[PDB]
Paper text:
Here, we explore the viability of such a mechanism by inserting one de novo designed alpha beta protein into another such that the two beta sheets are combined into one. The backbone geometry at the junctions between the original domains is regularized, and the sequence at the newly formed interface is optimized to stabilize the single integrated domain structure. Crystal structures of two such proteins demonstrate that complex beta sheet structures can be designed with considerable accuracy using this approach and provide a proof-of-concept for the hypothesis that complex beta topologies in natural proteins may have evolved from simpler beta sheet structures in a similar manner.
A beta turn segment between two beta strands of the host ferredoxin was removed and the resulting cut-points in the host beta strands were linked to two beta strand cut-points in the insert, fusing the two strand pairs into a single, longer pair at the center of a six-stranded beta sheet. CD spectra show that the protein contains both alpha and beta structures. Crystals were obtained which diffracted to 3.3Å resolution.
Numbering used by the authors: 1 to 146
Write the structure that this text describes.
């Protein structure tokens, strides 16, 4: 009685707005939407990475959630939990922005943990996940439990 959705290496506005609408629909529908966000930064400019950490910590710590991280030399991992789903989309836009500003390499991943929803919702979101994967040519997967 649960559906997860996993997205990675996201594309420009057309995709973000579309995704947002799926995000929106899901929240409305009679269920619990638990979202988790992961980003990994890479680059030799360690000073840049340390600030990219600090901006995302401060912004995302203003939500009723928490933040964890690790630095495997020149690879910084960030795991954000507890954030409202309609904002999540915008924290994605901010972490891409930091990739450009500091001229560093960044990857992004969204985990949506939907609990107790209709099979009509599951099939539509599936079709929307099937659709977006193909139009934008990116990493898209999902899981359903019963």
């Amino acid at each position: 009685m649960e559906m997860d959705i996993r997205f990675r290496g996201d594309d420009p506005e057309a995709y973000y707005k579309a995704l947002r609408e799926m995000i929106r629909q899901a929240r409305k529908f009679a269920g619990t939407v638990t979202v988790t966000l992961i980003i990994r930064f890479r680059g030799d400019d360690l000073e840049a990475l340390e600030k990219a950490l600090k901006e995302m910590i401060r912004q995302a710590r203003k939500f009723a959630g928490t933040v964890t991280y690790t630095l495997d030399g020149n690879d910084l991992e960030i795991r954000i939990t507890g954030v409202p789903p309609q904002v999540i989309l915008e924290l994605v836009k901010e972490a891409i922005r930091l990739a450009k500003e500091f001229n560093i390499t960044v990857t992004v991943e969204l985990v949506i943990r939907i609990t107790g929803v209709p099979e009509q919702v599951r099939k539509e979101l599936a079709k929307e996940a099937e659709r977006l994967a193909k139009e934008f040519n990116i990493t898209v997967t999902y899981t359903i439990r019963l």
